[model samples]
Target: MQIFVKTLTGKTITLEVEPSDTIENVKAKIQDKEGIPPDQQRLIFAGKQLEDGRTLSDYNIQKESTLHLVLRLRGG
Candidate 1:
């Protein structure tokens, strides 16, 4: 299935993934294309936080589902 990711910067990117793909897997793919590390990425789908260990199908994510991506803020 293909998923749509909307970044905090309002940039959108499409990723191709299997239904069994973990959120962490999706994050890794985003990291490759957007240069945002998986640890720093926060994905929100259907008004809930998407967990790394969960598969897309676990969340009932279908083809063309849109996930909002926010960057985790860190300060020293």
Candidate 2:
């Protein structure tokens, strides 16, 4: 199935994956498409934070679900 992830600035990525894919996998895909690291990203859906070790089905994610990307920011 396909997934929708949106950035804070209105960028979007349409991702394709299976039920067995982990959120970590999603992060890697996002990193590939946007040049962001997995360690610097968070997947937010339905007001819940996604765990990298878990699969999409673990959170009941379905087709065309638009997830919000929470980018990590650290002040120097």
The prediction achieving the highest lDDT against the true structure is 1
| TM-score between model 2 and native | 0.85
Report the C-alpha displacement of residue 37, candidate 2, in angstroms: 2.1
Once fitted onto the true fold, the runs of candidate 1 whose alpha carbons sit more than 4 angstroms away are: none
lDDT against true structure, model 2: 0.82
Instruction: Report the lDDT of model 1 for residue 23.
Output: 86
lDDT of 1 by residue, 1-76 (tens): 7888889887888989889888888878889879867767887788688898898999999899888888787844
lDDT at 50, model 1: 86
Worst 10 residues of 2 by lDDT: 67-76
